[model samples]
Target: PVQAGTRTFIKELRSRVFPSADEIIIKMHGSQLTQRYLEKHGFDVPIMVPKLDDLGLRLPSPTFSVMDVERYVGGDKVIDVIDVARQADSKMTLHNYVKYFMNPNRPKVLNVISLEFSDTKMSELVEVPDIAKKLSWVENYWPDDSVFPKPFVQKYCLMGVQDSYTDFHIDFGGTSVWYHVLWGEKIFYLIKPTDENLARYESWSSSVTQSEVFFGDKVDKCYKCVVKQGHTLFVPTGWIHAVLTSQDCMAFGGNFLHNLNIGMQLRCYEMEKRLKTPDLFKFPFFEAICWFVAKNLLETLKELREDGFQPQTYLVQGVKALHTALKLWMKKELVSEHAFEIPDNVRPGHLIKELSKVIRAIEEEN
Candidate 1:
């Protein structure tokens, strides 16, 4: 499988099926769409809605739609308008958290990924102050533009799936995420920040040295939460999560940056970045920290592999070495007046890419 840059983050969007809708009729030979067919027929375009001779093109159905204008004639300014409308109130909550956290107490923990835009026809480069105007819903519904220009809003859609499962894994990106069950049911296994669960999934080893950070001699332990219609789940940045959904469900969610979550993400990133460079051992103290880190990494990797969680063959060995190096560095750096801080030049993402490459090389097939 191909791997994207570790720094890249994603925001997921979906729609809600509301009581009122401009319906579109689709007909087929009683055939259900295959996974391949569903994937190939992208969600951007709906196939059923048509242009009528008498009315020209009618409005497309919007699930739980919100909009800037009460009524708009012509092709989908209506749908597009609602895309931005629903988020007007949401933007306010976002502004409060991001502005305060920009200069934070524990800057080390925060990982900042600028808010991502969704299908709202807004470009990524545009500043936030201008975002509301360009989007129709915000233009009509959101009256306040006092805090313009600062990038506070990230736009995305909400999708509902029925009878589905969200596989177990940590989030792909390092930000906190909110998943809502708009009109369906889902069961989630929310894992706490304990070593047993983290080790089981092999998450955050690259972030911190996998020491006895949370648990020891433990295997798997996590409680489950079942969410039904009109409920939301606020998952922390690093917690491992999995979900299973019921048939024909409606849901919406996003991975966003608030003060608390971003800080945690960045701290993990910086700690991982320092471990990538083998040269940190030059200081005797740094070396000792690395050694301790290496030991934990090795143990974690061994345990995961032995349990039949196969990723790549070399992953186990590489993680072990990582733990050893971390211990060596921490032991040395902690006591010093000048603690080891992540250099501006050393991107945490860079280290992740390099480490992944090393794993691939070591595990290459003979």
Candidate 2:
């Protein structure tokens, strides 16, 4: 239970973050989480999957150990490690981290989370949930022959000791994410990404006192989610979340950019630039992906028209938002900065014209 503790300024502030679980987390069977379902309701809430089997995700048995992860990912592979207590980060080889993980007593609280395993031997050990694959533009629209290298935002391995804490953050590029607790337990403090919350987030992000404050304390609601072994969690784009390792744990998760919330995605990217989020922390070739999505969207609209099918409401609105943003990006002053991402085969002006026409037809239908 979330009991109110000592009434320090931060604690008092956190007491008001969100009244209760009924106000935030929404639990659902994985079977109900379909593309159609999400579009109908909007992906604005935190959804929990009580069973991994329902999600079409498979992993090593719950009995799997950290040593097995090292063996698969390679003991010598260097990985980023976060010092939870000091809120600092450093790098260490898997072998060394495993050695530390196996110790009975540890010198510092450290967390290894969302370590990209796409290129490693361990990549074969887990598969992302079906709904995520079906909805993700990165998984579905990204071309195999694309000239720009693909972003390896998928497939991460998280290992943390009891008591490790990860501060609140929105996934880079405003991508939504999925996570499954392979073993042990983890708790999340979730904050909604409403307009007022996002505005306050920007202010907090830019403040020098950020590390000293808890972001949940500044928001209208912050819900606590405890994900136990075999349970899966889907966090939608732009939602702010902090994690705590309630027990020593191993988890697998992935992030993806999708078409459902084009406006919010673009807004998050702009916010990243405003905060000067480091390139290492930002999505790779984000603008390039936007260009790719625009090119695909134009063709999609044509197909819908040819079939005499009305576009879904979310699709229509997302495209209109995308078109509006593209028009702004194509302006003379901004074109030079965005030109690098324009695919060789894409003509920005022609694409924008096509998008405008599609939006016009969509509006006419309404």
Which candidate leads the pack in lDDT?
A: 2
Error of 1 at 20 (Å): 35
- For 1-366, candidate 1 gives per-residue lDDT tens digits of 111111110111012112211122121121231223323442111112121122111122324322211112112321211011111112222222233233335221121122233434433212221211221122232223322222222333332223233334444333345444445466555555454555454554443333222221223444445556644444555565545444344444444332223323333334434444221221223222222333333444446545755543233443534533333334555526323332223333344344454445435522
lDDT of each: 0.34, 0.81
In candidate 2, what residue range of length 10 has the lowest lDDT sum? 1-10
For model 2 the TM-score comes to: 0.91
Q: For candidate 1, what is the lDDT?
A: 0.34
In angstroms, how far off is 131's CA in candidate 1? 19
Best candidate, TM-score-wise?
Answer: 2
What TM-score, computed on C-alpha atoms, does each candidate reach? 0.33, 0.91
Candidate 2: where is the Cα deviation over 4 Å?
1-18, 279-282, 306-309
